[PDB]
Amino acid sequence: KTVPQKVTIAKIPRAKKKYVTRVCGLATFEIDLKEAQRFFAQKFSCGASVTGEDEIIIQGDFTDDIIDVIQEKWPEVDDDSIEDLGE
Ligand SMILES: [Mg+2]
Ligand SMILES: [Mg+2]
Ligand SMILES: [Mg+2]
Numbered sequence: 001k002t003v004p005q006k007v008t009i010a011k012i013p014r015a016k017k018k019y020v021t022r023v024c025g026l027a028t029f030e031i032d033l034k035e036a037q038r039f040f041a042q043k044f045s046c047g048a049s050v051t052g053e054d055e056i057i058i059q060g061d062f063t064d065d066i067i068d069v070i071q072e073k074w075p076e077v078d079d080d081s082i083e084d085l086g087e
């Protein structure tokens with residue numbers, strides 16, 4: 001319906017690695033993005049930023065393993081509810 005009248009601002013870091021991994025939709029599971037950002041940063045020892053309403057950016061390509069990491073950390077994310085958009 002009507003899109004909310006609302007302004008958001010976010011700083012987004014320059015990518016220093018060959019890739020960045022963008023994670024969207026954790027908030028639709030009521031996962032707190034600050035908690036998620038902390039987990040990813042500590043888990044991977046790479047930079048992680050909250051960059052959108054429902055969006056986290058991780059420095060590095062973690063697409064081969066991040067689905068299993070997310071599902072282990074937040075097991076409410078069932079197999080039918082998470083996917084790599086590059087595949
Ligand atoms: Mg991959
Ligand atoms: Mg692997
Ligand atoms: Mg899995």
Ligand SMILES: [Mg+2]
Pocket residue numbers: 083085
């Ligand atoms: Mg798809």
